[PDB]
């Protein structure tokens, strides 16, 4: 099982989300206040109430990714539903118990794929027993010693080591089979047709169910755009409603679905958004109060950037190096470009409109349009990417405001 202490939770955070400590902090305080529970009895296993979180602040500084990530290391199943959607001011038809239904549909194509390296390496030593079986059969009547089985190997395990270097031969092996095929096929087959025997009844469900149930985490994005305070950001309280609908979810219900009936009850909720338009004080009271833990995030810096450009472990930048290396190019970003790199983000974000950390992403892939293209030429060649570089393909762009409008 998972847990992690408060700080532990944080620290893996600072691994991919620069700054906003306060932020992290809370979310972890929610995720232990979580664990804690379990460890009680039955009374209070069921009278204490997922400490759901309200995420006030500007855009692109990481409310989402703070959640997204928290959850990945919780190893919780997770989904982010935009608040908008349930509005349909195009007037369609939106039901909110859907949300829970998709927090299962990952809670699966999550259980699945998170079962093919736990039970994959367990059955490449079971797809071999099925070819060292057709090239040379362990002659009828095994005289039980389990050590006269590694004794077929007296040539059998000479073919076992010869499966990795010489294949493409015509063979046929044992709703079963009885089929005559070929070996590089078949090798790619059995595998598949073997994960099946790696039992998938009321296990990939029931426990996938447990998934959601135990908990993930839903991040209800934008909540603020669904509540009133008049003028420009009120049509009707034909939005107020979606706060209502919502309630139950957060406030605790069962729900109908596909793989099994699910209990929202204990699910964790993380409600986002910026409120230049209203004020959290402005939710329906009901909601207001299921959002116990409130926290601010604040806009990142120039530095903050620079640092997001490199101190993220998946770093953007690196994404480059490696990507870029693949064509035979070392690439290497100075202190002093990683400086302008940011520097631009910030200047651009300040003239057009500011989209968050977001800009770096675009500013970059643009830096490289040159390199990133010609790359397969540079076969070995290496390049120095630095201020003086940067500014040559940037400055006038960033310069041209109205271009940036289009193309950054």
């Amino acid at each position: 099982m998972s847990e992690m202490t408060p700080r532990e939770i944080v620290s893996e955070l600072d691994k991919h989300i620069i700054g906003q400590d306060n932020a992290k902090r809370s979310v972890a305080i929610a995720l232990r206040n979580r664990w804690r529970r379990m460890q009680l009895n039955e009374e209070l296993r069921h009278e204490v109430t997922p400490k759901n979180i309200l995420m006030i602040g500007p855009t692109g500084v990481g409310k989402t990714e703070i959640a997204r990530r928290l959850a990945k290391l919780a190893n919780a199943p997770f989904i982010k539903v935009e608040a908008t959607k349930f509005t349909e001011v195009g007037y369609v038809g939106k039901e909110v118990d859907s949300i829970i239904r998709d927090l299962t549909d990952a809670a699966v194509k999550m259980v699945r794929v998170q079962a093919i390296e736990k039970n994959r390496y367990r059955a490449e030593e079971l797809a071999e027993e099925r070819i060292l079986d057709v090239l040379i059969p362990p002659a009828k009547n095994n005289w039980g010693q389990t050590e006269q089985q590694q004794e077929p190997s007296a040539a059998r395990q000479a073919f076992r080591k010869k499966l990795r270097e010489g294949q493409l031969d015509d063979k046929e092996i044992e709703k079963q089979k009885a089929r005559k095929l070929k070996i590089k096929d078949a090798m790619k087959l059995l595998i598949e047709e073997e994960a099946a025997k790696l039992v998938n009844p009321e296990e990939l469900k029931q426990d996938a169910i447990d998934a959601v149930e135990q908990h993930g985490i839903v991040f209800i994005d934008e909540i603020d755009k669904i509540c009133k305070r008049g003028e420009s950001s009120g049509p009707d309280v034909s939005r107020e409603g979606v706060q209502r609908d919502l309630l139950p979810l957060v406030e605790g219900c069962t729900v109908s679905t596909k793989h099994g009936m699910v209990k929202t009850d204990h699910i964790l909720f993380i409600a986002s958004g910026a409120f230049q338009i209203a004020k959290p004080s402005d939710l329906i009271p009901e909601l207001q109060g299921r959002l116990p833990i409130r926290v601010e995030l604040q806009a990142l810096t120039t530095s903050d950037f620079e640092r997001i450009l490199t101190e993220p472990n998946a770093s953007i930048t690196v994404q480059y190096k490696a990507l870029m290396a693949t064509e035979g190019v070392n690439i290497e970003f100075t202190d002093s470009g990683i400086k302008r790199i940011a520097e631009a983000a910030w200047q651009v974000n300040e003239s057009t409109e500011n989209i968050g950390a977001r800009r770096l992403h675009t500013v970059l892939e643009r830096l490289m349009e040159e390199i990133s293209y010609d790359a397969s030429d540079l076969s070995g060649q290496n390049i120095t990417i630095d201020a003086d570089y940067v500014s040559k393909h940037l400055d006038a762009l960033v310069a041209d405001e109205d271009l940036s409008r289009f193309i950054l």
């Binding site: 003028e231 420009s232 230049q276 338009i277 806009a299 300040e350 409109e353 500011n354």
Partner: protein, 180 residues
């Protein structure tokens, strides 16, 4: 008849940034209902001075749409100034609205009008409402004349003061605001 404008005066001198306004609420032709009202507020973490001229519904109301849009762009008056104009010029209920809006920051200074104007005073003095001109005439007057001899804060105080002195619709009790 109607309630008369309040007079309000903003000025920006030797890098101090200042807004004075009267309290006088002059109802009907001649009648006075109150002698004190706050229509000069501090907005955005004391970062901006804004005085309105008008009704405190209208007043309050505009103010937040200036807020909202100030956040909505991280400190750029001009920008938000504008995008309010658009908003005010268009809205059915405020587009008709008479008075204007004085907005200023650490740096710079703006008239903003129901009608979708946005104005920039060459000389760092703006002024609205009843006695406007009288105080404008005081403002510009002093700055030009005892810039050295007096302050931001001071010059504005005085604007109003003079106003109430020529002006029936302006009165001695002045509210004063400055940024840091």
């Amino acid at each position: 008849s109607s309630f008369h404008a309040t007079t309000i005066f903003a000025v920006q001198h030797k890098g101090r940034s200042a807004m004075s306004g009267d309290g006088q609420v002059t109802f009907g032709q001649a009648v006075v209902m109150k002698h004190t009202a706050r229509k000069v507020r501090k907005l955005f973490n004391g970062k901006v001075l804004a005085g309105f001229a008008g009704s405190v519904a209208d007043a309050f109301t505009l103010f937040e749409k200036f807020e909202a849009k100030l956040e909505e762009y991280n400190g750029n008056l001009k920008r938000a100034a504008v995008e309010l104009a658009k908003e005010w010029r268009s809205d059915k209920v405020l587009r008709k609205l008479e008075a204007m809006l004085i907005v200023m920051n650490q740096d710079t200074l703006l008239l903003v009008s129901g009608t979708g104007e946005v104005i920039e005073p060459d000389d760092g003095i703006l002024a609205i409402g009843s006695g406007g001109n009288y105080a404008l005439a005081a403002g510009r007057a002093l700055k030009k004349h005892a810039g050295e001899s007096m302050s931001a804060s001071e010059i504005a105080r005085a604007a109003l003061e003079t106003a109430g002195e020529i002006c029936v619709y302006t009165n001695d009790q002045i509210i004063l605001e400055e940024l840091e």
